[PDB]
Design an enzyme around this catalytic site. Structure first.
Site, PDB file in Angstrom:
ATOM      1  N   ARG A 180      37.129  45.354  11.794  1.00 26.12           N
ATOM      2  CA  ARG A 180      36.536  45.527  10.473  1.00 26.12           C
ATOM      3  C   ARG A 180      35.219  46.288  10.515  1.00 26.12           C
ATOM      4  NH1 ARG A 180      38.747  40.189   9.990  1.00 26.12           N
ATOM      5  NH2 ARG A 180      40.269  40.057   8.289  1.00 26.12           N
TER       6      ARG A 180
HETATM    7  N1  LIG Z   1      42.919  47.961  -0.395  1.00 28.44           N
HETATM    8  C1  LIG Z   1      42.889  48.089   0.932  1.00 28.44           C
HETATM    9  N2  LIG Z   1      42.915  49.331   1.461  1.00 28.44           N
HETATM   10  C2  LIG Z   1      42.884  49.460   2.793  1.00 28.44           C
HETATM   11  N3  LIG Z   1      42.834  48.516   3.730  1.00 28.44           N
HETATM   12  C3  LIG Z   1      42.810  47.294   3.171  1.00 28.44           C
HETATM   13  C4  LIG Z   1      42.836  47.001   1.820  1.00 28.44           C
HETATM   14  N4  LIG Z   1      42.799  45.630   1.615  1.00 28.44           N
HETATM   15  C5  LIG Z   1      42.755  45.133   2.826  1.00 28.44           C
HETATM   16  N5  LIG Z   1      42.755  46.083   3.815  1.00 28.44           N
HETATM   17  C6  LIG Z   1      42.717  45.859   5.274  1.00 28.44           C
HETATM   18  O1  LIG Z   1      42.815  44.472   5.515  1.00 28.44           O
HETATM   19  C7  LIG Z   1      41.627  44.001   6.195  1.00 28.44           C
HETATM   20  C8  LIG Z   1      41.293  42.613   5.720  1.00 28.44           C
HETATM   21  O2  LIG Z   1      40.458  42.683   4.567  1.00 28.44           O
HETATM   22  P1  LIG Z   1      39.631  41.399   4.063  1.00 28.44           P
HETATM   23  O3  LIG Z   1      38.592  41.059   5.068  1.00 28.44           O
HETATM   24  O4  LIG Z   1      39.199  41.655   2.675  1.00 28.44           O
HETATM   25  O5  LIG Z   1      40.756  40.272   4.076  1.00 28.44           O
HETATM   26  P2  LIG Z   1      40.652  38.726   3.649  1.00 28.44           P
HETATM   27  O6  LIG Z   1      41.919  38.320   3.005  1.00 28.44           O
HETATM   28  O7  LIG Z   1      39.387  38.522   2.902  1.00 28.44           O
HETATM   29  O8  LIG Z   1      40.524  38.025   5.079  1.00 28.44           O
HETATM   30  P3  LIG Z   1      39.802  36.624   5.458  1.00 28.44           P
HETATM   31  O9  LIG Z   1      40.608  35.552   4.769  1.00 28.44           O
HETATM   32  O10 LIG Z   1      39.933  36.565   6.958  1.00 28.44           O
HETATM   33  O11 LIG Z   1      38.377  36.750   4.963  1.00 28.44           O
HETATM   34  C9  LIG Z   1      40.584  45.065   5.899  1.00 28.44           C
HETATM   35  O12 LIG Z   1      39.531  45.053   6.841  1.00 28.44           O
HETATM   36  C10 LIG Z   1      41.415  46.343   5.912  1.00 28.44           C
HETATM   37  O13 LIG Z   1      41.701  46.710   7.254  1.00 28.44           O
END
Ligand SMILES: Nc1ncnc2c1ncn2[C@@H]1O[C@H](COP(=O)(O)OP(=O)(O)OP(=O)(O)O)[C@@H](O)[C@H]1O
Ligand SMILES: Nc1ncnc2c1ncn2[C@@H]1O[C@H](COP(=O)(O)OP(=O)(O)OP(=O)(O)O)[C@@H](O)[C@H]1O
Ligand SMILES: [Mg+2]
Ligand SMILES: [Mg+2]
Lengths: 53, 500, 465, 75
Positions: free
Chosen positions: B367
């Protein structure tokens, strides 16, 4: 490496038999007069701890 | 010689039997000791038993104290005397632990003698907050081409190494430790990094082989090995990641940079599950306690990048997770994925085909990304990532067009380019040159079986009579189009010289 | 009066009072402690001893240590002076800008609004996201829940909603970071600094931030959401404003409640949960509402442990929300971002009498096409595409085009990818999906439908190929 | 100083053993049979491992350069 291993093995054997002989001689080192002296010293230390309240 | 050491050990073994508020062991069993007494004891306070063992006062019940024993339970009998130490559970920290193998409590097990530590730090320390933290911007160089290009790691980042057994997780971690010798031997103190390896639940022969491998590569001079093997007690395996984290937190809080590896956290969670099941605590998912997420989160939150007002220090974590049949949908892997900033997934299928390291590019992400890379590496890795994405898009269906065959050949050459041997990490300039040659089409006429030989010979050629190229790269910090054209010309000259 | 600590186990501190007992939910300040250890009373144990959950760490606590009753619950500063400031669970400022000088305080525990203080207005909030604005549209004033696992993308969707809604909002905003990464909170704070929503030099800040993160003890993570609720409730009732409340994430609140449940001497519920999970979540969620005094639009992230939707905590949270956006790992494995499940997201605003007949018919047609494709996937995985009939091939081709067109490049996700983020008006969304459903674009490759905002970008990308 | 009698007795026994070892020329003093057997077994194992049976390792070994036959330059 052979000289190092030979000297280390002889040193380890010397340490082991020295420790065992020290244990045996300490078990043979107890005399009743020194036992009374050590008991009196332990009583004096216990009394000194009793002072430190 | 020996008699002086005996005199020093006798003089230093002062009993000092004074005061010593104590308690009596009511019952011993299942690794938990109930102690009657110790009225003024604190929570999580270290105690000493009569046999020389140590423990942690876990439960402060009214009529007894529940103490978790750091050792075997056959050395403790009913009615033994438990002495309080007056200190919450702490381990020695410092630069005295560099080059040493210690246990979970900090006692050396390598036979090198006592550690001349001056400071001790507690293992239950809270993590820094929002204000003493800054964005991760310094690169962590593991020396692996696939990691340094595709899944970059920054200093302060938490990056997971997850995969099945016998897939190369420990190999990646030890290569990351070995790669820091070039930074540690240099003069830049900011780029020096101090490594901590925490072996949890492994075999003792494996840890001995790891220590020998670190000693042969001279990576031991900046490495602390915390060992809690498979024959040790479960509380020692639970305590060892926190003891190593405290040793890394010493360098973190003193303006230095530390990299810590927990191999592996799945065995620590198994030991903690054993401790909780022997404490009659309610089991949850897969019979694990409900605070195992909190266990890993409080361990891994202490690895972070500090601010300039806090000394500018950092602690980098590389947790290791062993999965069953490649399932990342299990409880513990999903917990560590949610905690950490990214993962490096290792495939058994790629490992059986000889692709080493068997890194799954489609699943291993980071990330942080561009902030954890140098300019030239980022410039060439963006093109490498796009070309590998195109290759994975066209090889999924092709199981043809000239462009599709070109993309397939390019992806095959990049895949063979990313393969790297064990225990030989590379400097960032060599990786930048190698990925530059692969990306720019310089390997289009080269067979995939000869890429490794070309890579070795090109590295030799650059180090032989192209030192000015490396000087220009180091001075500019990137690849200018003029130096790009010069590099293309000397690559063409080299490939024509090798075969004509 | 004055009490003394009689037990410390984990984050649970039992304190014994001599004369008078503090009530339930009363805040107690530990004497002799430097960084303001505050204990919240959870139950009266009896024999003049009460049991408390600590809002910070319990290390260094000795038995018999003095604790002082404050005579009130945890009171947090509320008002215009909290805008642009960062607060912890107990309302202390943590942004290092000085104390929050206000005259108004409120308790973090309050009763829910009554049945007569309810509004039934359902007006669609346009987010600019095609999968959101078509299949599960959001409502102006109401609860939105982004369900997702580990790494499927919920923070990115939270930041995209803040970028698309909160900046062009006008009313107010509150962010509540609950048990998440402190790096995310630092990045969001600096993002609001750069975008001008927070002014460090003067007034007219529009967002107030409350952060209690995953490094905090479970007592702190179980009450910081109530602190953010208290800020939003003051901005709704006592000011009559339109408030945006973003929480990330709710599961950390309901997990921190379960971490202390074993230490409170409770029988565990199914799969080792707290037996009062439903009632605690109910009392928390019913405070987040749109009343007749003011409006609150709330977006809450929800984490599913081990990618499971039948877990009791998300299954309880499902019935407390208006719009649900379920994110799937399998869709994220296919490269479709945002990885919203089209057949698992509901809104209750998806009604032909609310959002329009054409919009409802297009959304139901898309859902039927994707359900037919999901039913065909079992035969496709074995016998391939050759055994399918011509109508099945048309169903598969249109469904794959629909799945690609549901993806959209986000402005906040550009640093991850490099694609320019696109804001899609809802009329362009329904026009593009009506074009796909009518078979007007069957002659285009499906790769042209991938990572493009409007249908004009689909035509341009197809002509570029 | 409050010197413990046990520590002083231990130091006296160590000094006594050192004086007796000097009187014995540094040889092992009153060692048990099992320690002597283990020492002889370890010395024999190291002698067999390091090839001390073939030649005396305490002296400088002699070497012989194995006379080389190159590949046939001619056909
Ligand atoms: N809209 C998007 N466009 C591109 N990549 C994305 C997108 N949404 C998510 N990703 C990818 O997925 C990864 C995870 O994103 P994020 O940290 O928001 O997930 P999360 O569901 O909040 O995870 P956690 O529960 O571990 O916090 C990002 O770092 C990116 O690599
Ligand atoms: N890059 C590599 N090149 C060659 N051999 C490698 C490489 N990486 C790993 N190996 C070999 O693969 C084997 C297993 O690697 P390793 O022990 O590091 O994996 P592991 O996942 O830690 O295994 P375990 O589950 O037993 O701990 C070893 O024999 C090691 O030499
Ligand atoms: Mg291993
Ligand atoms: Mg997130």
């Amino acid at each position: 490496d052979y000289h190092l291993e030979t000297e280390r093995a002889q040193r380890q054997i010397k340490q082991k038999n020295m420790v065992d002989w020290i244990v045996r001689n300490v078990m043979k080192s107890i005399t009743p007069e020194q036992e009374r002296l050590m008991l009196s010293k332990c009583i004096s230390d216990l009394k000194a701890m009793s002072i430190k309240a | 010689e020996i008699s002086a050491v005996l005199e020093e050990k006798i003089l230093g073994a002062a009993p000092k039997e004074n005061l010593e508020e104590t308690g009596r062991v009511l019952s011993i069993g299942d690794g938990i000791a109930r102690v009657y007494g110790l009225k003024n004891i604190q929570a999580e306070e270290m105690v000493e038993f009569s046999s020389g063992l140590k423990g942690m006062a876990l439960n402060l019940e009214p009529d007894n104290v529940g103490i978790v024993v750091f050792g075997n339970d056959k050395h403790i009998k009913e009615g033994d005397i438990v002495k309080r130490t007056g200190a919450i559970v702490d381990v020695p920290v410092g630069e005295e632990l560099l080059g040493r193998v210690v246990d979970a409590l900090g006692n050396p097990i390598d036979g090198k003698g006592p550690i001349g530590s001056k400071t001790r730090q507690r293992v239950g320390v809270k993590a820094p907050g929002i204000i003493p933290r800054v964005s991760v911007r310094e690169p962590m160089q593991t020396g692996m081409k696939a990691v340094d290009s595709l899944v970059p790691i920054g200093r302060g980042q938490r990056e997971l190494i997850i995969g099945d057994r016998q897939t190369g997780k420990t190999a990646i971690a030890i290569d990351a430790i070995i790669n820091q010798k070039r930074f540690n031997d240099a003069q830049d103190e900011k780029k020096k990094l101090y490594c901590v390896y925490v072996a949890i639940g492994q075999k003792r022969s494996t840890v001995a082989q790891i220590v020998k491998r670190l000693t042969d590569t001279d990576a031991m001079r900046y490495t602390i090995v915390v060992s809690a093997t498979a024959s040790d007690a479960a509380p020692l395996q639970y305590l060892a990641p926190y003891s190593g984290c405290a040793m890394g937190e010493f360098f973190r809080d003193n303006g230095k940079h530390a990299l810590i590896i927990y191999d592996d956290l799945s065995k620590q969670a198994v030991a903690y599950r054993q401790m909780s099941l022997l404490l009659r605590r309610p089991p949850g998912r897969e019979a694990y306690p409900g605070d195992v997420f909190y266990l890993h989160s409080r361990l891994l939150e202490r690895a972070a990048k500090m601010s300039e007002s806090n000394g500018g220090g950092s602690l980098t974590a590389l947790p290791v997770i062993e999965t069953q049949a490649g399932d990342v949908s299990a409880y513990i892997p999903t917990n560590v994925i949610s905690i950490t900033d990214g993962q490096i997934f290792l495939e058994t299928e790629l490992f059986y085909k000889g692709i080493r390291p068997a890194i799954n590019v489609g699943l291993s992400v980071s990330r942080v990304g561009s902030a954890a890379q140098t300019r030239a590496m980022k410039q060439v890795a963006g093109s490498m990532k796009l070309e590998l994405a195109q290759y994975r898009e066209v090889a999924a269906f092709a199981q043809l067009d000239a462009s599709t065959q070109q993309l397939l050949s390019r992806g095959v050459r990049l895949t063979e380019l990313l393969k790297q041997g064990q225990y030989v990490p590379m400097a960032i300039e060599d990786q930048v040159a190698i990925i530059y040659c692969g990306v720019r089409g310089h390997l289009d006429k080269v067979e995939p079986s000869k890429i490794t030989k070309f890579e070795k010979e090109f590295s030799q050629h650059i180090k032989t009579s192209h030192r000015d190229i490396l000087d220009t790269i180091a001075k500019e910090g990137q690849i200018s189009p003029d130096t790009d054209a010069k590099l293309k010309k000397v690559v063409t000259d080299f490939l024509s010289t090798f075969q004509a | 009066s004055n009490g003394q600590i009689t037990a410390v186990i984990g984050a649970v501190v039992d304190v014994q009072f001599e004369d008078q007992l503090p009530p339930i939910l009363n805040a107690l300040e530990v004497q002799g402690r430097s960084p303001r250890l505050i204990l919240e009373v959870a139950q009266h144990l009896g024999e003049n001893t009460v049991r408390t959950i600590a809002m910070d760490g319990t290390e260094g606590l000795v038995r018999g240590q003095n604790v002082l009753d404050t005579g009130a619950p945890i009171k947090i500063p509320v008002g215009p002076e909290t805008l642009g400031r960062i607060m912890n669970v107990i309302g202390e400022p943590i942004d290092e800008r000085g104390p929050i000088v206000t005259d108004k305080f409120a308790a973090i525990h309050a009763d829910a609004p009554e049945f007569v203080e309810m509004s039934v207005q359902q007006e669609i909030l346009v987010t600019g996201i095609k999968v959101v604005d078509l299949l599960a549209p959001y409502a102006k004033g109401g609860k939105i829940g982004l369900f997702g696992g580990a790494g499927v993308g919920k923070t990115v969707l939270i930041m995209e909603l803040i970028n698309n809604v909160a900046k062009a909002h006008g009313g107010y905003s509150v962010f509540a970071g609950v048990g998440e990464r402190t790096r995310e909170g630092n990045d969001l704070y600096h993002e609001m600094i750069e975008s001008g929503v927070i002014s460090l030099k003067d007034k007219t800040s529009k967002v107030a931030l409350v952060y209690g993160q995953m490094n905090e003890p479970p007592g702190a993570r179980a009450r910081v959401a109530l602190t953010g609720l208290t800020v939003a409730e003051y901005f709704r009732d006592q000011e009559g404003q339109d408030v945006l409340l973003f929480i990330d994430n709710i599961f950390r609140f309901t997990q921190a409640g379960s971490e202390v449940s074993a230490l409170l001497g409770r029988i565990p519920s199914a799969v080792g949960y707290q037996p009062t999970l439903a009632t605690d979540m109910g009392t928390m969620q019913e405070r987040i509402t749109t009343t007749k005094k003011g409006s609150i639009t709330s977006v809450q992230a929800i984490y599913v442990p081990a990618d499971d939707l039948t877990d009791p905590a998300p299954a309880t949270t499902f019935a407390h929300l208006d719009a649900t956006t379920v994110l799937s790992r399998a869709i994220a494995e296919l490269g479709i971002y945002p990885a919203v499940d089209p057949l698992d997201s509901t809104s209750r605003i998806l009604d032909p009498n609310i959002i329009g007949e054409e919009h409802y018919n297009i959304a139901r047609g898309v859902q039927k096409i994707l359900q037919d494709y999901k039913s065909l996937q079992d035969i496709i995985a074995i016998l391939g595409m050759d055994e399918l009939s011509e109508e099945d091939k048309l169903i598969v081709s249109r469904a794959r085009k629909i799945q690609r067109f549901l993806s959209q490049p986000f402005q906040v996700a550009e640093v991850f990818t490099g694609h320019a983020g696109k804001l899609v008006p809802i009329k362009d969304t329904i026009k593009g999906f009506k074009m796909i459903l009518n078979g007007e674009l069957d002659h285009l490759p499906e790769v042209a439908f991938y990572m493009v905002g409007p249908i004009e970008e689909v035509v341009a990308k197809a002509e570029k190929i | 100083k409050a010197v413990d009698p046990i520590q002083k007795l231990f130091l006296d026994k160590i000094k006594e053993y050192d004086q007796k070892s000097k009187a014995a020329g540094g040889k092992l003093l009153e060692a048990s049979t099992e320690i002597q057997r283990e020492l002889d077994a370890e010395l024999d194992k190291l002698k067999k491992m390091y090839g001390g049976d073939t030649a005396d390792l305490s002296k400088f070994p002699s070497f012989h350069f194995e006379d080389p036959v190159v590949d046939p330059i001619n056909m």
